[PDB]
Design a protein around this ligand. Structure first.
Ligand SMILES: Cc1cc2nc3c(=O)[nH]c(=O)nc-3n(C[C@H](O)[C@H](O)[C@H](O)COP(=O)(O)OP(=O)(O)OC[C@H]3O[C@@H](n4cnc5c(N)ncnc54)[C@H](O)[C@@H]3O)c2cc1C
Ligand SMILES: Cc1cc2nc3c(=O)[nH]c(=O)nc-3n(C[C@H](O)[C@H](O)[C@H](O)COP(=O)(O)OP(=O)(O)OC[C@H]3O[C@@H](n4cnc5c(N)ncnc54)[C@H](O)[C@@H]3O)c2cc1C
Ligand SMILES: Nc1ncnc2c1ncn2[C@@H]1O[C@H](COP(=O)(O)OP(=O)(O)O)[C@@H](O)[C@H]1O
Ligand SMILES: Nc1ncnc2c1ncn2[C@@H]1O[C@H](COP(=O)(O)OP(=O)(O)O)[C@@H](O)[C@H]1O
Ligand SMILES: Nc1ncnc2c1ncn2[C@@H]1O[C@H](COP(=O)(O)OP(=O)(O)O)[C@@H](O)[C@H]1O
Lengths: 249, 497, 497
């Protein structure tokens, strides 16, 4: 389902089903479009927790107060908007795999709290004081440069060390261009079979992929091949057809 | 009333040997045929005793009976063997009667006989042919028997009696025949009614406790023509029935063993393949954690210290620790096996589970575990590596069995079921054990965690492995939490429609 | 020749039914036997036509010959089905002759017959019992042939003719006997000379390139009594031979596969448990490096910080990193599979090297690899676990095949040899693959090492398992530094003297 053959892929791919089996936290280091969500998904489907809930959480998309509440749970009325008591992500996914996207945007004060939990598997509600030992698995992920934040003091160092414990650095597609032909074929073959017509890409676009720096990695690659196929009446994605998807050179 | 010369001509013209002798059996007259049959000339016959025709083979009781009844003035009838002038021997049916004068006194003896060589040549040929059936019957290793229209055993061999002794309590061939008729059914009835020879029909006997005996059954109609004298011009045929029964028991069962053994053989490599992948999945995982924490530390101590960082012995300390691990992570990751595409072939899941149960049956009965297998009548075959899907069965069943040894198992039972639910082949292996503690239902799935100590075969890997096989199929495996009288593991895997 | 009155009494006392008739065949005189044989009384016979004896069953055609031959003054001989007064029917060999007067003119006719019913009831029984032989043989599966004293084919079934077409070029039953006769030898000789039944003589025929066809041969003696009329009172027996052959070819061919297959599982299961144990050492050794280096960082960091060590977020996490490292190291060490006690037994590696190649023959042929195995003529038994020693060879073969598969190899050759050296059983496997560079000859045995490209299934664990199990057997394993045309791995294992 996931393709790649460069030496960098050997670490990332083998790390996928590796940490899949264990209960250890996972930090998925990588820029946008690297696969962090799907790396965790491939991790989950290859984890014994494949049969258990798989939770994806973006720590940057939630307020600090809501972020602390979500992971450990909160009592009713703890903050504005808490109309009903909500079970924490640590407990809702107890025995499950927790994907924490953009883990590096958490506040310094909470970072101390998350540290203790990751050491002993014990945590407290936001407002509760009953210590619960949980066989919880974590999958962190961050594209932020936490090193600057710890350097600037906005990120606690103790947790950052505890967060980058399972660092799986998904390399940019720029360093693994040898995988581009193998990466594109799986998507192109899938969409070609899916649409009922051969969705082929011209050689001119292929040269672009080899020379592309890939700030967005395969996400920008995927958004184009799928749109390109649409206006290619025969499915033959031509570079002009590639251009209509809005991908910058 | 007739002229005496007519009686003289009556004897003379006969084609049989007729002789008139004195009281001493000296031939005084002979017809044309007596010369022809006995080979003696007209002049050579006068005066010779009838004792010359005896060759000594006839019992003396026959001759004394012949002569004894003559002294009683009574005819005597019997069959003799006479010798012709050329010394050839033929069966001569001789009857000698007295010649009574007008006063009733015996004056002469009468010697008549007819050629009956054909008679004996055919009964002995019958006796020989009767011996032919008796001897040929004795030779067949296949239990063979000839049945008449009433299905009576006319001849049986030791093997059929041995089969009767081996298959029937009494050891009699007749009793063995009765049982075979019921099992043969159509081929026997077709043979009985139409006489059509049937060959190669296999039947099965499950006698309990012993491997069922599978027999190769063959048969043919055996035809006898009518013998009675009045049907010489129009013989009519009857029908016996032949049943030939050959032992092919070990042949058919042994087919099961090899495929059963290739079954455990082919799967046996995967748990290594998953085991080698799983066992090594622990190496980097345990390394990846502590190592990366250090890899950050160099970038940590570097940024705040900046220029002085390069002179900090601490900054070198974590760098060395991180670099050593990073080398391992690359070397450990770079040499990981890449699975070859195991030939995806049509796999009969019920076929395997019926088979894997056969391999693991012995240790199930060792614990008194009742194996109740209910293969799905119509289960689609999955396009995949037979070996890999085969392997995951043993991992799940074995661990459940070890729970069968625990005293919480009031009744020791192994339950294996296959069904298609949610468009997936749902494999449920339920057991009557104490089960897994609810808090440890997943920690057991953690690699190397074993509630039973790792001091036994409990590498904490069987549950991780089944997931990897299940995961390789993009499936899902879970323990049914509703069942608490043991551990019920549920495996959902895609199948080829 | 004698007195006329004797002839009249000769007919009266004649044992056969004799009657003197006119030209129309009306009986004028009857003898005692005619009454006894035909059942007609003396007075009831006089004046009655001979047609009373006629039943109509006999064809009318013969009667023209009967009456016709009388016209030319010639005897007529034939067999008729006569009718007695009680209406019973018997075979009557009737001869009719004319009665001449002194002038040579026919004056009277003679009726004269003999009972031949017993003759026919047996010749039909001959034909009947003959047909028993012809039929029974056809449906029997086992190939059987009836042989005379000169080994001539007396009887054969379609299967024997089919077997002749299958075992002999010409397809003749007689030629099949020649091929079958040579192989049987002693059981056939014992049966022929002494008539002793032999059962279960199994012979193997190797067709060449095909599965050898095994035939189960059984043979009994057939007895024929003498038929000639002269042995009526003392028949003499002769001996023929029946061979009965059943095919047991398919069973034996399937028999080898099960043992081959069953043993495939044993090795694969064994290498898993052994493969586990050595990965532990690499994991523990691999983990120990970074983890200890993590450990050392804390104390050296603590000393500089002093009182600030308590509140240093840097120190706390790295403190745990060693703590996790200590826990990680402990988890690996304590979870080693404690092998169920492997009976350290004398094991002959020569037996196993034959197995593995037969086990591994499938993959070797796919790549066009020539396998040269040179088992030691006398290999002393290796003391140790047969389960452990069996996995040894496949690990070394797995090393060759995977590197053998790399396309850098143009010529694909695999050489295996065994010998005894220095009180140790020394084994070597040599291939034509890329090989081990001289500098890597020794550190390929440090666990997990592998330079094989990731494209192949490179566990890096074969030699280490050999190193692991070799250590279990108090031996030594190393790769020959001198060989550069491939890889030559040396395994030394002590043997039970
Ligand atoms: C009319 C007639 C026809 C015969 N036809 C035949 C024939 O076709 N084939 C054949 O084998 N035999 C025939 N016999 C019998 C024959 O006469 C011999 O008895 C017989 O052959 C046995 O002879 P042997 O020398 O082997 O035995 P022997 O011991 O010489 O005689 C056998 C038995 O017959 C008795 N016996 C023999 N001769 C006389 C006699 N004259 N008076 C009283 N008792 C006597 C003996 O006491 C003894 O019990 C016939 C006899 C008669 C009267
Ligand atoms: C001495 C003697 C003994 C016989 N014994 C027997 C016996 O034991 N059993 C038996 O079945 N038959 C016997 N026959 C034959 C018998 O006479 C009949 O031929 C026979 O019974 C068939 O009779 P039908 O009425 O079926 O046929 P029919 O047609 O009456 O006769 C059969 C054939 O014989 C011819 N034939 C019949 N009678 C005479 C005759 N008087 N002169 C010339 N030709 C004639 C006919 O032309 C015809 O071709 C005997 C004949 C003779 C002379
Ligand atoms: N190694 C890979 N092989 C194949 N596809 C990949 C790989 N990495 C990323 N992708 C593709 O990139 C797309 C977006 O990945 P995403 O999870 O958004 O990465 P990120 O978390 O870095 O944004 C996915 O649809 C996925 O198919
Ligand atoms: N069916 C089951 N019933 C009870 N316990 C089980 C069952 N399956 C697994 N377990 C538990 O899971 C633990 C780990 O098993 P696993 O990880 O499969 O490898 P291993 O059994 O070799 O340790 C065992 O200690 C066992 O107690
Ligand atoms: N029989 C062999 N043929 C070719 N190369 C071998 C052989 N055995 C070992 N090697 C080389 O030595 C290295 C280590 O082998 P080993 O430790 O047995 O495990 P693996 O062969 O799986 O790497 C391999 O990377 C391979 O290049």
């Amino acid at each position: 389902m996931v393709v790649g053959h460069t030496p960098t892929m050997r670490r990332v791919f083998d790390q996928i089903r590796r940490v899949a089996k264990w209960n250890s936290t996972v930090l998925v280091l990588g820029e946008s479009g690297t696969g962090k969500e799907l790396i965790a998904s491939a991790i989950h489907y290859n984890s014994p927790r494949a049969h258990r809930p798989f939770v994806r959480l973006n720590c940057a998309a939630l307020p600090e107060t809501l972020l602390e509440s979500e992971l450990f749970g909160h009592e009713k009325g703890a903050f504005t908007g808490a109309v009903k008591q909500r079970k924490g992500r640590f407990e809702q996914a107890d025995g499950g795999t927790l994907f924490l996207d953009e883990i590096g945007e958490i506040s310094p004060m909470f970072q101390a709290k998350l540290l203790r939990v990751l050491q002993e598997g014990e945590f407290e509600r936001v407002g509760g004081n009953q210590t619960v030992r949980v066989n919880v698995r974590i999958v962190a992920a961050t594209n932020r440069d936490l090193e600057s934040e710890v350097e600037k003091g906005k990120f606690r160092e103790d947790l950052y060390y505890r967060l980058n414990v399972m660092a799986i650095r998904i390399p940019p597609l720029r360093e693994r261009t040898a995988d581009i032909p193998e990466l594109a074929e799986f998507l192109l073959g899938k969409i070609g079979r899916q649409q009922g017509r051969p969705l082929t890409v011209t050689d001119s676009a292929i040269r672009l992929l080899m020379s592309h720096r890939w700030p967005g990695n395969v996400r920008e690659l995927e958004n184009c091949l799928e749109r390109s196929a649409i206006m290619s009446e025969d499915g033959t994605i031509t570079r002009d057809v590639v251009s209509l998807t809005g991908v910058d050179n | 009333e007739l002229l005496p010369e007519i009686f003289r001509q009556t004897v003379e013209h006969a084609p049989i040997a007729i002789s008139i002798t004195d009281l001493k059996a000296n031939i005084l007259y002979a017809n044309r045929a007596f010369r022809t049959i006995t080979g003696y000339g007209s002049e050579e016959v006068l005066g010779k005793n009838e004792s010359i025709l005896s060759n000594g083979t006839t019992p003396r009781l026959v001759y004394q009976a012949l002569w004894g009844r003559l002294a009683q003035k009574k005819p005597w009838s019997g069959v003799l063997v006479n010798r012709r002038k050329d010394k050839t021997l033929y069966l001569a049916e001789l009857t000698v009667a007295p010649v009574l004068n007008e006063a009733g006194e015996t004056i002469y003896y009468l010697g008549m006989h007819r050629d009956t060589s054909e008679l004996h040549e055919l009964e002995q040929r019958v006796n020989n042919q009767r011996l032919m059936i008796e001897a040929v019957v004795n030779a067949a290793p296949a239990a063979m028997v000839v049945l008449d229209r009433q299905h009576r055993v006319m001849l049986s061999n030791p093997s059929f009696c041995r089969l009767a002794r081996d298959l029937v309590e009494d050891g009699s061939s007749e009793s063995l025949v009765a049982l075979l008729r019921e099992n043969l059914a159509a081929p026997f009835e077709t043979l009985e009614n139409q006489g059509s020879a049937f060959s190669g029909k296999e039947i099965s006997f499950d006698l309990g406790g012993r491997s069922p005996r599978w027999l190769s059954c063959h048969g043919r109609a055996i035809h006898i023509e009518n013998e009675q004298a009045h049907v010489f011009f129009a013989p009519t045929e009857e029908r016996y029935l032949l049943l030939t029964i050959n032992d092919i028991s070990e042949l058919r069962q042994k087919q099961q063993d090899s495929r059963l053994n290739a079954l455990k053989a082919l799967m046996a490599e995967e748990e290594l393949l998953e085991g080698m992948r799983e066992t090594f999945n622990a190496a980097i995982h345990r390394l990846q954690g502590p190592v990366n924490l250090i890899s950050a530390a160099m970038r940590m101590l570097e940024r705040r210290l900046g220029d002085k960082a390069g002179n900090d012995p601490v900054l070198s300390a974590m760098r060395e620790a991180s670099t050593a691990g990073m080398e391992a992570l690359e070397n450990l990751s770079g040499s990981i096996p890449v699975r070859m595409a195991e030939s995806k072939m049509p796999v009969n899941l019920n076929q395997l589970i019926r088979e894997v149960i056969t391999l693991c049956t012995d240790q199930l009965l060792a614990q008194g575990i009742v194996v109740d297998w209910q293969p799905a009548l119509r289960l689609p075959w999955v396009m995949g590596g037979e070996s890999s899907l085969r392997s995951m069965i043993k991992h799940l069943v074995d661990n459940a069995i070890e729970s069968m040894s625990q005293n919480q198992v009031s009744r020791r039972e192994l339950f294996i079921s296959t069904r298609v639910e949610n468009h997936l082949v749902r494999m449920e292996i339920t057991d009557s054990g104490p089960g897994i503690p609810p808090d440890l239902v997943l920690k057991v799935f953690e690699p190397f965690f074993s509630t039973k100590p790792p001091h036994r075969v409990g590498r904490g890997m069987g549950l991780p492995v089944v997931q990897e096989i299940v995961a390789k199929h993009a499936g899902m495996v879970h323990v049914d939490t509703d069942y608490r009288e043991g551990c019920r593991i549920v495996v959902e895997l895609p199948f080829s429609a």
